[PDB]
Design an enzyme around this catalytic site. Structure first.
Site, mmCIF file in Angstrom:
data_model
loop_
_atom_site.group_PDB
_atom_site.id
_atom_site.type_symbol
_atom_site.label_atom_id
_atom_site.label_comp_id
_atom_site.label_asym_id
_atom_site.label_seq_id
_atom_site.Cartn_x
_atom_site.Cartn_y
_atom_site.Cartn_z
ATOM 1 N N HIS A 135 42.018 17.601 -26.043
ATOM 2 C CA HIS A 135 41.692 18.436 -24.870
ATOM 3 C C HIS A 135 40.379 18.075 -24.212
ATOM 4 C CE1 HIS A 135 45.005 21.738 -25.026
ATOM 5 N NE2 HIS A 135 45.447 20.529 -25.295
ATOM 6 N N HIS A 193 51.568 14.874 -32.197
ATOM 7 C CA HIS A 193 52.564 15.830 -32.737
ATOM 8 C C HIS A 193 53.167 15.381 -34.076
ATOM 9 C CE1 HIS A 193 52.806 17.950 -28.571
ATOM 10 N NE2 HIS A 193 51.591 17.986 -29.087
#
Ligand code: HEM
Ligand code: HEM
Ligand SMILES: Nc1ncnc2c1ncn2[C@@H]1O[C@H](COP(=O)(O)O)[C@@H](O)[C@H]1O
Ligand SMILES: NNC(=O)c1ccncc1
Ligand SMILES: [Cl-]
Ligand SMILES: [Cl-]
Ligand code: NA
Ligand code: NA
Lengths: 713, 713
Positions: free
Chosen positions: A77, A244
């Site tokens: 992020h 992920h």
């Protein structure tokens, strides 16, 4: 309290040029972060961060007993706000700890992650920035969980107040497309410079475009937004599937349990936000995105299970406990571990955006190759994680510490090492005399060097005159650079260089990059002489010439100036007024308002305008360095009106006779209209200011010529 | 573009502490305005301005052939924004040329006045500031028309961006009272710190209160607003009658002819505004306020005809050509000249607010005395004009040039001259050791010196430790200053001083003003020593002791601190959150956010809180100078909650055990909540920061001690 912004909501905002003063900065004006970092014991910091991975705090218990996934998301992020359009966003200034990014919905509970790091930040103090720490912590998370990183560079200095960035015009967080401030138009085209699909998201919506769970459609958005963050298809699939591989999402109950974001919470929250009324509010009960997906059978260890699951099951649409769309594996056993309860297991699940990697046809082929060849997946992910997290750090000269990869990558716009003696002051005088004797004009010399140096932007530290990339594709063909004129100047400079270099002993030579800048300086000297002033312009040698193969043409296209007020250039008509675009450019150039003012007034009279336009050329002695631009701009003897042909062009006429004296653009005239800019213009247009104008101009000229010179930092 | 201010409209605004950086300033970092002004040939500037008064420009033709009335109004408005409540507004920073004041409706067409002055500004350049020139031009206008001014001081340096000032909450220019953002409550109580009746007005509405043309009622508003600008009845009548001896108003047709104010006009207007479609738009057709009054028979010459007319006729309510209420003399001859047509004359007219001077009973007596004794009128006006136009200039030491009045006025808070040798460094060390040996504590010494020095405000440069007014009425009885403790400290210091002074040779002595500050410095040195650090705190002697008779007690009332975050003090419950009041105070003290942060954390642990409150005293070594405030504030082992008794007080409890560790206020806790403040707190709370904390604390302490020391500029 009503402000100027309330009364005149479209006036130009100059405060953006005057952020980051020494007033807001707690460090001395002498603090050098590079020097502090060079003394940090980096290994010791990494040992502490390894320990932190499994030291769970009760106030935000670690999933699976390991904070690695959370920290990887934190780092992703921090880097993931980046846009190639202007270079703004990215990890390089540690802006995640300030508004608004600290409170974006996609950054929910990353406040807890940052707080976990406070003890380490405190221990090491100024020797490691937050900005570096966020990225390092991501690297260590990966290492702790079995993944070997490509490397790491320190050197991201902290900043001390929020950047002014255009993140969009929506007034509602996460607003879906097509509202009154829609960032989309046409055939789902995202407006430049934006690189996210909704206000407060990093890239795309995990449920699908505007919440519709179509993985094929989601792939379109993924591809567009990641491209706008400098990532191609291979990198994109490597990054998403890589990330992920670890951790989980959080959506254990309805979103309405979640309270105020940090910037809205009460003072007792002590800088944290999103407090949840759902059960314990944390750990097994955590709510972050509202989705409830755990991708792999070993969420705390590097594996090849992401692609095994992706391709190994068929997927059924379902809903999380917060009501969000997500996918569950048809007929699967419960093989995924629970984060807190050793006696529970779960079926494999996926986000709509994970399925994109299989159901978009171009992604599918890459995903298959990564599934079949996991070594290639691991290598691509490592390279892409390095790129992601270093994209905005600038030239390799800024990279600090012992873990910097030795391999030079194309995306870094590399500059070859200098391996020979540099020109000295006597050689500089000789080359400037040759340049002046060749017949190149002030206007040609100044325009060429401005074109070369002013591609720099401080947002991602890309561009500048180092490399002589003005002679390569695509810069040599940009309309703003005047290709035919540029070609003739470069040809004359190349012959000068070849002759100088061939006469040398001992391996001394001059790069074309240095000579372009040096020739610009000679042009400025000649102009000052034309005005009767004796001026030496500073020049630092040491630039090198990059090759075409070291210059990725596509990546270079975002540095094309489609608006450059300093050359009175606009490539087409835009919704944003040209004076807003001027201030935007000045900000990327790192200029204050006084510097922008002096620089533009001087360039106008030196003949730097594209196409030789007379707009703003308020002098009768073009190619002489004077303050004529200001003295004539401020002359109340002249009245100004928009032209009949064009509302963005203005005629200046003698108030008594009606005779036309000058024409100008919005960029020219804003200096006589905006009340702060006009106060600056006044200083330089005063009768005592001629020498100050010349000297200030030389200083800002030199500043621009050196913007990318991190080899001398 | 959505900003942080849009998303979190009530977060605290720190940018107000970071205006006036070197970035925004076009003058070099070494520019000294006082030095430039000292070499200005002021007589030559005044001769140019004299010639200007009758050199009409066709773009804004001079009424009666003379610009004097216009320029007097310009200077009066430049000074007339002043408020005694916070010292903000006034002529001292030349703020009339920036938003919002440049565009206030009460400043309509003063843009034309400022533009008339550009040729003179340009000629003399940096040697005369706009700020000084606005006032000088008013003086010269007066002189040119036969009025002897009381004097003039230069020294107002120009500023380069708008000040952040609370001018009210209304979102509509000139909004009448009683709206959703009414500045009035109760029995027509104007909210502090405001000093005008409507948004965008200087003082009062010339038609009368909210447009109602009752001169009696208007007198109430005049009295209230002028008091809030530091003017009593005598001064008020002298100023209004004085000003309205000259020139005229402008209201030749309907106000709907008048276009956009400067900040909203098009770029082609080149910084001017209020362009009028009525006939020629200027001169005889001018529209400014919408009223059409010419007060005297010789609008370009000083006279006593304002009062002759005021008392000589009876008055009838009437309407201007724009529809505004105004007054005409019943059955008078047409004796008032026209501004452009030598063959036309007019009856005497007045504003409702002019009639206030006759129909308010207290005004009427003063007005009668001035009518009967115009010499008294002239003297009062001259004194009041000087006061008006210098009220925010600060101590007399800042006054420059050859026209400064020699008379010392009570409103100046004067400081006597020093006529003796000053203490040297060895004497300072001796006195610090004596103070420390007397048994006064760190907490008493710090609290006393802070109380004395922190009355300073940079907005009007009133207050500070010079003068030792802390020992006089009213300061010695302010609740924040802890009167009984203060009296015991002052008694001990006085004995030390009397002993030191009586032991001296050669006239050397120390003032009590110097000794209070020096004693505070000893307190800080002792505290640093208590923490195991040897520092010397800088000290500059040369303060003097003012007398009670040199101290206007009423004028001093506005400097009482009713909120001082630095001593955790709030005198009552307010609208405005305490952390906003903290930032307000820091801005008056001229502190940056880093300076405010260091200063507050250090004062907490030195015992500077009023009443010995433990709020924010996050240390177990009170009276030792450490960074304990920050280390404990940022400790995530502590959880905070508002108390049951008081939502503005918080308890900090051990997160694991529930044990009570600390209490604090909103002012304490904001440093752990606000994202920019907490980033500062982190610097000082880090393990490497002890030395930096001490050094920075001593620097900001010393800055505060020296704020009023313009004798050393
Ligand atoms: C299309 C792009 C992506 C989407 C839509 C996306 C979406 C999400 C969402 C919705 C979450 C759950 C947040 C929560 O509820 O706690 C999450 C978690 C995560 N993502 Fe992504 N993601 C994307 C790309 C990436 C990339 C590029 C990386 C890293 C290289 C990454 C690494 C992670 C990790 C590690 C987690 C788990 C966090 C934890 O364990 O607390 N993702 N992602
Ligand atoms: C209750 C206080 C005051 C009120 C309501 C007031 C009101 C006004 C108004 C409405 C105008 C006309 C603006 C225009 O249409 O051009 C004006 C003009 C003027 N006022 Fe005031 N005034 C006040 C006090 C003062 C003071 C204190 C001074 C100076 C000492 C001053 C000096 C002037 C002058 C010189 C003009 C003439 C402008 C010209 O000739 O262009 N007034 N006043
Ligand atoms: N203009 C649009 N608006 C919304 N969805 C779109 C649009 N264009 C394409 N898509 C979605 O993206 C998918 C991929 O299409 P394409 O990217 O055109 O190959 C389509 O089948 C749609 O589901
Ligand atoms: N918003 N951030 C920028 O535009 C930037 C940051 C650092 N140097 C130059 C420009
Ligand atoms: Cl940014
Ligand atoms: Cl102000
Ligand atoms: Na950036
Ligand atoms: Na002021």
């Amino acid at each position: 309290g009503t402000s100027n912004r309330d009364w005149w909501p479209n006036q130009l905002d100059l405060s953006i040029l005057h952020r980051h003063s020494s007033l807001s900065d707690p460090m001395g004006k002498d603090f050098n972060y590079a020097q502090a970092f060079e003394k940090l014991d980096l290994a010791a910091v990494k040992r502490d961060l390894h320990a932190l991975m499994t030291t769970s705090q009760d106030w935000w218990p670690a999933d699976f007993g390991h904070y690695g996934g959370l920290f990887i998301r934190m780092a992703w992020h921090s880097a993931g706000t980046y846009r190639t359009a202007d270079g703004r966003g990215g990890a390089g200034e540690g802006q995640q700890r300030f508004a608004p990014l600290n409170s974006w919905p996609d950054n929910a509970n990353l406040d807890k992650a940052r707080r976990l790091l406070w003890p380490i930040k405190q221990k090491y103090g100024r020797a490691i920035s937050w900005a570096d720490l966020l990225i390092l912590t991501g690297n260590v998370a990966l290492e702790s969980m079995g993944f070997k990183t490509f490397g790491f560079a320190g050197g991201r200095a902290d900043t001390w107040e929020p950047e002014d960035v255009y993140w969009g015009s929506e007034k509602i967080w996460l607003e879906l497309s097509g509202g009154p401030n829609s960032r989309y138009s046409g055939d789902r085209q995202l407006e430049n410079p934006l690189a996210a699909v909704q206000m407060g998201l990093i890239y795309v919506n995990p449920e699908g475009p505007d919440g519709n769970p179509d993985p094929v459609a989601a792939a379109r958005d993924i591809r567009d937004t990641f491209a706008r963050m400098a990532m191609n298809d291979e990198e994109t699939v490597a990054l998403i599937a890589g990330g992920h591989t670890f951790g989980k999402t959080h959506g254990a109950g309805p979103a309405s349990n979640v309270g105020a974001e940090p910037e809205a919470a009460g003072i007792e929250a002590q800088g944290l936000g999103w407090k949840s009324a759902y059960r314990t509010g944390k750990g097994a009960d955590a709510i972050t995105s509202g989705l409830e997906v755990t991708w792999t059978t070993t969420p705390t260890q590097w594996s090849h299970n992401f692609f095994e699951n992706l391709f190994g099951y068929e997927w059924e649409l379902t809903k999380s406990p917060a009501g969000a769309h997500q996918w569950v594996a048809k007929g699967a056993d419960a093989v995924i571990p629970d984060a807190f309860d050793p006696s529970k297991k779960h079926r494999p699940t996926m986000l709509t955006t994970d399925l994109s990697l299989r159901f978009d046809p171009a992604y599918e082929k890459i995903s298959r190759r990564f599934h079949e060849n996991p070594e290639q997946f691991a290598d691509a992910f490592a390279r892409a994680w390095f790129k992601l997290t270093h994209r905005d750090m600038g030239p390799r000269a800024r990279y600090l510490g012992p873990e910097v990869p030795a391999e030079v990558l194309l995306w870094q716009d590399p500059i070859p090492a200098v391996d020979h003696p540099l020109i000295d002051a006597a050689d500089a005088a000789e080359l400037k005399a040759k340049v002046l004797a060749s017949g190149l004009t002030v206007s040609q010399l100044v325009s060429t060097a401005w074109a070369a140096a002013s591609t720099f932007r401080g947002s991602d530290k890309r561009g500048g005159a180092n490399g002589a990339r003005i002679r390569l594709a695509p810069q040599k063909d940009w309309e703003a650079n005047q290709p035919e004129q540029l070609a003739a100047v470069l040809e004359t400079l190349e012959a000068i260089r070849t002759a100088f270099n061939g006469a040398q002993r001992g391996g001394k030579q001059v790069s074309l990059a240095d000579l372009i800048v040096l020739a610009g300086c000679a042009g400025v000297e000649q102009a000052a002489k034309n005005a009767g002033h004796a001026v030496t312009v500073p020049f630092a040698p040491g630039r090198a010439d990059a090759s075409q193969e070291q210059t990725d043409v596509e990546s270079m296209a975002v540095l094309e100036p489609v608006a450059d007020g300093f050359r009175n250039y606009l490539k087409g008509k835009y919704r944003v007024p040209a004076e807003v675009l001027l201030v935007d450019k000045a900000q990327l150039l790192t200029l204050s308002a006084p510097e922008m003012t002096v620089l533009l007034g001087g360039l106008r009279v030196l003949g730097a305008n594209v196409g030789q336009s007379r707009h703003g050329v308020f002098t009768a002695r073009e190619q002489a360095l004077t303050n004529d631009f200001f003295v004539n701009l401020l002359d109340m003897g002249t009245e100004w009106k928009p032209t009949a042909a064009d509302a963005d062009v203005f005629e200046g006429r003698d108030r008594a006779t009606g005779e036309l004296k000058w024409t100008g653009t919005r960029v020219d005239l804003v200096f006589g209209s905006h009340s702060q800019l006009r106060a600056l213009a006044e200083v330089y247009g005063s009768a005592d200011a001629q020498e100050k104008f010349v000297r200030d101009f030389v200083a800002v000229w030199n500043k621009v010529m050196n913007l990318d010179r991190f080899d001398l930092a």
